[model samples]
Every structure is written in structure tokens, then in C-alpha cells.
Target: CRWAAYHGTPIFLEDVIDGFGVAWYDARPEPGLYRDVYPAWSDPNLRAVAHHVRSGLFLSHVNNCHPFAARRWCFMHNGQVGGFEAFRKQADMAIADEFYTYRKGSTDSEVLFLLALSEGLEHDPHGALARAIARLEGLSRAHGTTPHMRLSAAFSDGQTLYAARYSSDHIAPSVYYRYSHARQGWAVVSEPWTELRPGRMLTIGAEGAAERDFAP
Candidate 1:
């Protein structure tokens, strides 16, 4: 990963270093902690893979890290919302009270994830995600923003993976997924992996189970 001018906070995985499931974030990028400190990618004991990197401007605050874990769920998202501060407050209030208590960040991405959880993400991933986005759009409209939102999000409950690529204006950020013949399962990412060419990657569906795209 090229250092994009040391722009934001870095949240490194303490689990990778200490063999525990914890996270570490700081404004300073300690090169000693990450640079040249590669994991044994082929180690069987460390074979499990579920990673997310939140690298954006103000969104890189420690509390705004993606793969935000809560209860039995975790989520990550890309893209942005217009008038996010206004809509975020509305969404926080609109979420189910039980789920709202877990929200700990001010980023629109985290709010979107919390909204899905409030709609029962663990029980009905697709339905909850769809409902959350619809509500988000409504909030944008209520806030007098154009509802020109982009949401490319992923959710998981420690087992099944759920993903959606959508936007109010039909121009979501890049979300790619493909079946890995080697790994023999589905895999998703923001961009094509080095092992996979662009032609081998496919954009996720806007509404369905990654099988069909919703037309604008």
C-alpha cells in the first residue's frame, strides 16, 4: 500500500502481532509496528480471513473503523452521504433503541451499519440492508440534501456474508466479488486482488444476493 501522504489515522491489527482479537489505532503511523512486519500468510493457524481498512479523510477517526464489531455482527462500508451530520442524527434516533446503544462513531458509514443492525441484520441481512438504505435516502431528502448517496457495504455475522452495492443516483463506488477457484468460495473486495485480473471480477448486485444488479 502506497503511503498516500500520511493523510489519516492508522488502525493496525493487534491480533496479528499478539495473537489476540483486538485493534489499535493512533494518529501517528509507527513504521516500526507495520512496515516490513508481514504476517505469515501461509500459516494454517492464521488462515481465517476477514479484513477491512478504513482509509479516508476525517472518516479515519479511531471510532470510525470499518468491520465495526457489535454483538455477533461486523460491517464495513465505502462511499459517502450528502449532509451526513443532519442525516446521521436522524438515523441514530430512528434506529431501534436496542441497536442504537451500540453506535459509537459519527461517520455516516458507521451509522448506516448500525441502522442495518437495528433492522435485524443477523436475522434478515438483505431485508435489513435494503430497509436501512431506504431510510437513509428518506433522511437525506428530509434534510434537503439531493439524496445523491453511494453505499457499497458488507455485513457478516461470523458466518454468512452479505453485501450490497447501491446508490440513490445509481453511481455507487466500486465493489467487486468473485468465486475463487483456489479458495473454492466467494470473495469480495473494493478492488481486484493481485491474483485476479479486472476481467475476472464482477460488480455486486444492487439488491439481490450478488446475482443481479438493480437498474437505474
Candidate 2:
């Protein structure tokens, strides 16, 4: 559903990644989902994702939605189920009030984030995310919905990142990532501000990149 790219500098995503929809929020030093509140992106606690990150890191998400707010947030999913409408209410009930207002995209991604938030803010992120996933799976099964959903979610709370690499059936589309630290630079075409931002120029060529230090 979501693919992320990371680098050592700030990478803006205003344009370029047109095929994959994107929106911005005030991520600042903290990370959270962005929604229809266009003004929220500049909130004091909120900072932009690109401004906080630099070379070599990026997130690209592709999704199929039920047609709601698109310019609200940047999120996507790669699977579908017949009963999302059945479980959406339950999912929304699971998130904290802080994130509920940011809900924008109509894809299944927002619900997943809320599931993690509902468990209690002080809880573990990975554990909370797992609970969210389990809740969805449980809801789908309880509703007799077919196993037609495949989820690959990626989120960050500014410092730590939570991303899933597996698919429900391994039958989903291909998602891949590669790194080249020695190459000196990398840029995400998703954000065009990188070219016009006036400071740095991104080089897409490869360097003596090795996989030892950064592989996880």
C-alpha cells in the first residue's frame, strides 16, 4: 500500500509523483497523518515530512478508494474487501481524538492508523499497530468478508518508523527499495520542490553503496 524513501536531507513532495496522490501536513519534528484541514500543515506542533527528512528516504503509496477527500492527506493501500463499510465504523472508534480530525483520504489506510491510536497513547507502537491489523482481520472474518485485502502500511512518529513488509497472500503488487550511501545523493520525484527549493541539487546516480550498515 505504502512505500517510503529516506535520505539525509529534506525532500519535498508537492509535485512530480503525480500518478500517486500526495498531500502535506505540518509534521515538523513529530510525525502524524494529514487530512482535509489544509491549514493544519502549518500548525506549530505540525511540521512537514520533507522538511524533517533528507537524502535517501521517501514514501510512495498507491491505493483504491471509495472517493472522499483526496487533497487532505497522503496515504494509499493495495487491497480491497467487500465489507470496509462494515468495519470502518469500528475502526474509527478505535483511534484517539487527536488523529480523528485529520482523517481525509477514503482509503483503508486511515483506519489502520486509528486502530493503533485507540489502544492508548503510551502503548508500544509496534504492538499497537499489530493490534490494529489483528482488529481488521478479526472484523473481516466476523463479517464474512472475503480475504481480498492486502495491506502494506508505513508510518512514522517523527523519531521511529513502523512499516510492514509482508502481504496477506504474497499475491500483491511488487514493492521494493534499494540504497546507495556512497552515491552521495538521492531524490524523490514525488516532490518537485527539491529542484526549485534553491539549496541543494539531487544526484540520482549510483555510488559505492553497500548493504551492511543500513539493512534492517
Candidate 3:
């Protein structure tokens, strides 16, 4: 699957008049998701959905359709725990038993997100993600070949966006970003996006973007 994400000043998620498996988040005191299979360009109600629907964070993705959400976090990714058939069981074993019930989908992305949540994503996004991948890469090598995981993923905690491009092979996936001065935020995508690092974690928030070594 392929994906892209955004983090910026709050704007009506509907301001983009968007759709195509999109999810928008707002505090509403709590977060909510907006999704439509109809292309935004063709939807007559796109403009009438209420201009009040914007959140600083918006996500668009392909495949699996749902990024999977738990509490305030929303996760989406474009990559895989390569050779999954060989280590599916081991990866399942890696998620915390507490988060096991949140599992609603069958994709690796869902597992990785729930696994990270179990690893404490609320308190330490990078470490939790790294930890989840750590177990995945370990399993990959143990059961399959190297380059255990190749991933370009994003998840957000309402106010901030965390994007990562990583892999056991160091070739992860394409990720790029550019500030949209007019929009007052950043656009991170697999296309032209400035994909953080070959292997690193990027946190984009009110303070701007920051990077850190991505490792378990």
C-alpha cells in the first residue's frame, strides 16, 4: 500500500473537500474519523458537509482502507513485515496482550500500530515504534530473510504527526515533506516528500519538525 500525511495549523478537514479513504481528526474534546469512499471531487455534498470539519491532522491512504485507530492515535503505513507468511505467528505474539483485543484488521500495519501502543506510544512514540519493529525484524530474520521490515508509516496524536521510513535492510520506503507556506504546515508524502531519513523518526508539531535516530 502507498500513503501520505499532513500536519499543520488546524483547518477544516473538509476544507480540502476531501475523500478517498481519508481520516480527519479534531479534539471535539475527543477525536473522530471522517471517511468516504466516494471521490471528494465528485461528491456534491463535499462542500455542504460543514466547513467546521477541519483538524490540523489529515491522512489519505490506499489499501486496507482503514489506518486503525485507538484512543487518540491514528496509524497508516505503506510497507510490510516482508516474508510475513513465515513470521505471522511470531509478530502476533509480539503485541501486548492488553492491546490484543484492539486488533480488528489483518494487515501488518494494524499489528505494528497496536504493538507500538502497547510499547507506550502515548509517552514515547519513537521508542514504541522502534520497539515494535525490533521484534518484527527479529522475527523476520529468525523465520525469513533479512530486511525484515520495509516501512514508510505515519501516526498522529491529534496535535502532532509522527512519520517514519525504516527497514532492517536500510531501504525502507520513500517519504518526503515540504512546508506549505500558504497553508501554514507541512505535507509528508511518498512522492516528493523529503522522506525524513533513510532510517529515522520524524516528529512534526507546533514547534516544527524534529528528527531522531530510529532504532530499537
Candidate 4:
């Protein structure tokens, strides 16, 4: 088709290099290892995450889809909800009419956003997101999908970012957040990216900086 490269997040930590695609894609902290795209913010090392940020919410998902038709916000979700297609229909019924136009793509994450929108995400994101996930989980179970559904996501409304690591099944994909009082900025800077932070940034993680929640 075509190819282009624009501004991207550059990370150079322990042994990672992150990269974000060209203009079409939202800006992402570039973590190295193009050989494969791994989950973001799942690292248990705060010193390593210092490359990212410290803010309201900063999500880094692995193996997820890019944004669809919407603008000003980007979401990345990991793990798949059971009976996602069926869940979409149920979710559609519950969504507000205004958000209908924002729906697109074959991603559970996108649908979740719409549900959040209907739940008034524009007004109260934290509450909307939590409810959306709860609904997804509830409907998935209703459809007789596996009782196990994984939904870990990072959502940003241009200013604030929110991330979650939750699943019906205890074992979900990896997700992390960075929290540091020293460096007040964010960076997925390992590879793919060269810059650390645009300015003052705050980073948070899923389960705090501890080896218990990470893979060795």
C-alpha cells in the first residue's frame, strides 16, 4: 500500500526499543523489539518504567488494535473477552444513540469505548470505564462464552489516561504502570522511540512495582 513515519516515542532502557507508527497512528512510547509487539506498562521495574510517565492514567497494552474512526482519544486493550461478537450486540443495545457513529473495527476494546461513551465517559471516564468492563464481563457470561475473559486496557482522552488489568480468569496477559516521585514524565522509551518525555509526565502501573506481579 503505502508507508510513512512521523513523530514516535523512543525508549532506550535495559534492553527495549519501542516505536509508534507514522501519522495514521496515535503517538506511542516506542519500546524496542520490533521482532514482536509486547504489552506496555507490564514491566515490574519502576527504574525501567521511568522511561514512561506519571499521570492520571497511562496504559500500555500488548497485541491490541489501533483506534478506529474516533479522534482525540486512543485505546489499547489486551486479552479477548469471551463471545466478543455476541457481546457487541448486547452492548450495542445498551449504548447511547450519540456514540453509534464512533463504532468501528473488530476489537473488543473499541466496543468497550462505545459502551463507556454511552455510560457517559465524556463526563466521568473512571466510572464509565469500570462499568463498561463490568458489562462486558456480565454479557460474555450470559452468552455462555467461557467464564474466562481477559480485558486489560489503557485509555486516554487526550489529557488523562486510564489503565486496568482485570479478567474473569485470574491469569491475564501482562500490563504495568510506572510511579515515580523523581522523574515527573512518561516514556515507553526503550526502542522504536528516541525521546523520553515531551514535558512533565506521571507514570503509574497496574500492580505497583513488585516482582510478585511480573514475569521473570
TM-score per candidate: 0.61, 0.55, 0.83, 0.56
> Model 3: per-residue lDDT, tens digit, 24-122?
776553356544565554655544543556667877664245567778788887777777777777777778888888887566778888889999999
Return model 2's CA RMSD, one decimal.
10.5
RMSD to true structure for each model, in Å: 11.3, 10.5, 3.2, 11.3
lDDT of 1 by residue, 1-216 (tens): 000111122322221220111212234221111121223344333233213432211111116545466676656666777787865667788778888777877878777788878887778676777777777777777783765567665555433444556777745555555544543344455532322221121222222223434322
Instruction: Write one digit per residue (lDDT tens) for candidate 2, span 1-216.
Output: 333334333344422121232332344443333322323244433245434523223344422331112222223344554377776776666666777775654546667655556654235544565566667767677763766345544343333322343334444333333343544333232211221111111222234222111111
Top lDDT prediction, candidate number: 3
lDDT of 1: 0.49
- Model 4's lDDT to the true fold? 0.45
Report model 2's TM-score to 2 decimal places.
0.55
Candidate whose TM-score is highest: 3
Residue 91 in candidate 2 has what lDDT? Answer: 62
Q: Could you give the candidate ranking by TM-score, starting with the highest?
A: 3, 1, 4, 2
Full candidate order by lDDT, most accurate first: 3, 1, 4, 2
- lDDT by candidate, in order shown: 0.49, 0.41, 0.73, 0.45
